[PDB]
Design a protein around this ligand. Structure first.
Ligand SMILES: O=C1N[C@H](c2ccc([N+](=O)[O-])o2)Nc2sc3c(c21)CCCC3
Length: 416
């Protein structure tokens, strides 16, 4: 279950407690300078809530870069402590390690109600469970090593707040080994769980999945899992040409073709029929004579097909008109994939109309969730993030969740 997890807002006893908070501070750092502070800014509602509620100590644990289980100062979290301090308007204590008596002494000696950032968790092979030493030899933590490290992290505080949904798909020590009585989601994790639970667990129906992207192969697990949940599914973008070729022997010219994924198309269609799911593939396409925004273009239907040396780059006008009834009649929408080469403005029309229809359905009461990177990029480029119910920032964890995979960091939270 996703929606029955204890959240930071449910936690009554915070005043005077040492609160351990797992955060996502995996930010790009160039010569000690943080190039993108968004992940740090995103944690401010969690930190402020714990400050306002009077926690004795706010102890932040995280990782960044690729230390691979040994201390590698290239991936030190020291600059993050400086940046966070500036954003909070107070000094953030930075510690050289994340476990041990010295760390415990420094935390206890620190000013009441203050924020402490401990060193990169992944400097310890026990965080990921395996790594590579400096020489390049594979290293592995034994069961006992793992248990010791997790007991050392548990000893840091009294209450655990997991605000790193982006790592919750990993069975890592800070995700599954912090055995405090209260283990609750932070504000970021809380919103991720609340909206994915709304979408996948007893949703307001019809439930629609809008899938898109270049290939079929990397989306097989996602499609098959969503066919167990949804009422309707739009399949678009570059992956649609493989479907058109297999199902209708449509000529696709030089359009993308997924050789390995083509072998699975019938299984997917057979599963949608078995699950009583309505599939909506495009029936026309905007075709180009070159892979370029300034190519000569025209619209071709799925009956005409695509001539040799031409390529389909976006859904056609009839396909776009077909989105209206499908999207506007849906009460829950999970969108994971643009419907064309949106990076090229002339091939963005299908994805933009899809976005406008999703916004309209949301305004009328539908719950809209945007899953991954490219769709999130389109929403950001169009400046419409405030018009979608939830735009996930979970990256790999969001994709695993939608594929129906177990999220060990979510499983490890306390129940409500
Ligand atoms: O790299 C490519 N991706 C695009 C793509 C992604 C999504 C869609 N869509 O049509 O929606 O098409 N389509 C083609 S043709 C093509 C390429 C791509 C590479 C060079 C040869 C011709």
């Amino acid at each position: 279950s996703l929606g029955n997890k204890l959240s930071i807002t449910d936690v009554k006893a915070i005043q005077g407690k040492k609160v351990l908070v797992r955060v996502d501070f995996n930010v790009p750092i160039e010569n000690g300078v943080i190039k993108d502070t968004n992940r740090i800014t995103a944690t401010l509602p969690t930190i402020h809530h714990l400050k306002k509620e009077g926690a004795a100590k706010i102890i932040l644990i995280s990782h960044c870069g690729r230390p691979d289980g040994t201390k590698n100062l290239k991936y030190t979290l020291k600059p993050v402590a400086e940046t966070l301090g500036t954003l909070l308007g107070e000094e953030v204590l930075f510690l050289s390690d994340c476990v041990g008596e010295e760390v415990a002494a420094q935390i206890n000696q620190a000013k009441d109600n203050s924020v402490i950032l401990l060193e990169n968790l992944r400097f310890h092979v026990e965080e990921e469970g395996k790594g590579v030493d400096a020489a390049g030899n594979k290293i592995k933590a034994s069961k006992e090593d793992m248990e010791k490290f997790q007991n050392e992290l548990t000893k840091l505080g009294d209450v655990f707040i997991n605000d790193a949904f982006g790592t919750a798909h990993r069975a890592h020590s800070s995700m599954v080994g912090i055995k405090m009585n209260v283990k609750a989601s932070g504000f970021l994790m809380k919103k991720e769980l609340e909206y994915f639970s709304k979408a996948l667990e007893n949703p307001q129906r019809p439930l629609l999945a809008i899938l898109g992207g270049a290939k079929v192969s990397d989306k097989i697990q996602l499609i098959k899992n969503l066919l167990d949940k949804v009422d309707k599914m739009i399949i678009g973008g570059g992956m649609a040409y493989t479907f058109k070729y297999v199902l209708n022997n449509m000529k696709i010219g030089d359009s993308l073709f997924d050789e390995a994924g083509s072998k699975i198309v019938n299984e997917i269609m057979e599963k949608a029929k078995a699950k009583n799911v309505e599939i909506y593939l495009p029936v026309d396409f905007k075709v180009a004579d070159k892979f370029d925004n300034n190519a000569n273009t025209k619209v071709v239907t799925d009956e005409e097909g695509i001539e040799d040396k031409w390529m389909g780059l976006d859904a056609g006008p009839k396909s776009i008109e077909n989105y209206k009834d499908v999207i506007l009649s849906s009460k829950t929408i999970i969108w994971n994939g643009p419907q064309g080469v949106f990076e090229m403005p002339n091939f963005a029309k299908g994805s933009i109309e899809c976005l406008n229809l999703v916004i309209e359905a949301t305004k009328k009461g539908a719950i809209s969730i945007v899953g991954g990177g490219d769709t999130a990029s389109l929403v950001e480029q169009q400046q419409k993030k405030n018009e979608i119910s939830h735009v996930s920032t979970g990256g790999g964890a969001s994709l695993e969740l939608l594929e129906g995979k177990e999220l060990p960091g979510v499983v490890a939270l306390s129940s409500k």
